[PDB]
């Protein structure tokens, strides 16, 4: 829905494997307009 309404914003997913979330975690080392997350993480 971030893509459908106004796609301009820099959106980060944050789900799945430790390796995949680690790859994204290092991006926020601003161009991170939202991160999409869940409470267990």
């Amino acid at each position: 829905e971030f893509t459908r309404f106004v796609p301009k914003f820099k959106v980060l997913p944050y789900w799945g494997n430790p390796h995949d979330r680690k790859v994204i975690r290092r991006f926020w080392s601003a161009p991170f307009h939202v991160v999409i997350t869940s409470y267990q993480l």
Binding site: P13, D20, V23, I24, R26, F27
Partner: peptide, 29 residues
Amino acid sequence: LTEEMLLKREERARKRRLQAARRAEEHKN
């Protein structure tokens, strides 16, 4: 003498961001 150290600096400076961004573009779909 520093140029051989500088060419190593610029190629790794692009390779760093390149691989991370390439993985980002493969990931998000």
